Write a protein that binds this ligand. Structure first.
Ligand SMILES: [Mg+2]
Length: 224
């Protein structure tokens, strides 16, 4: 069973390959997760130089297997149940009055390390919009990720709305439609309707000169 692999501190590697309106970029992330406290501590670096999109727009794309599922809700943890073979996570992120991100990721164990390999494709963004014009504040709000079962594809679906704070006090709504499917042919946990309560804190490393993001995240399952 997959939950046994998450009882302690597990190292994480995140690799993103992106293209937003022709602008190519790569992000490399390193850190660790401790599912017992639903804690994520990571440092992401833009390996290609300065990013053409704001760092907050990439948080949801950049490992829900580290969510803390209370003991009474363990039978509803799809994410850990798909491990070690892993799962495919596909998202369509629709930014209100702007373009969209279509992401495809494979989340799985590579030895004792949990890896998140992502391909991101962004299209139809406005040149001076909130995203390409870098008008988003370097912070993150607390959200609820509503999960439901997709018994047809032996996985789950998630529907949530992310609100990015704009520099003028307004908000940029980023509608998310998620779909997860297991890579392996082993039995997975099909959950009842519930949500993941998320809290994210963004910061910078004072000694780092490259474009980066330090992320402290806490994810807890609720709702049942
Ligand atoms: Mg077109």
């Amino acid at each position: 069973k997959g939950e046994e692999l998450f009882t302690g501190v597990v190292p994480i590697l995140v690799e993103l390959d992106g293209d937003v309106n022709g602008h190519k970029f790569s992000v490399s992330g390193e850190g660790e997760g401790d599912a017992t406290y639903g804690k994520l501590t990571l440092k992401f670096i833009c390996t290609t130089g300065k990013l053409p999109v704001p760092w907050p727009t990439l948080v949801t794309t950049l490992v829900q297997c580290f969510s803390r599922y209370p003991d009474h809700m363990k039978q509803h943890d799809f994410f850990k149940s798909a491990m070690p073979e892993g799962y495919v996570q596909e998202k369509t992120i629709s930014f209100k009055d702007d373009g969209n991100y279509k992401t495809r990721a494979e989340v799985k164990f590579e030895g004792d390390t949990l890896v998140n390999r992502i391909e991101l494709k962004g299209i139809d963004f406005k040149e001076d919009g909130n995203i390409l014009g870098h008008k988003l504040e370097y912070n993150y709000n607390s959200h609820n990720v509503y999960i439901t079962a997709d018994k047809q594809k032996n996985g789950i679906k998630a529907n949530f709305k992310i609100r990015h704070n704009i520099e003028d006090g307004s908000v940029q709504l980023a509608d998310h439609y998620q779909q997860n499917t297991p890579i392996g042919d082993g039995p997975v946990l099909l959950p009842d309707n519930h949500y993941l309560s998320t809290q994210s804190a963004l910061s910078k490393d004072p000694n780092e000169k490259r474009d980066h993001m330090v992320l402290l995240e806490f994810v807890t399952a609720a709702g049942i």
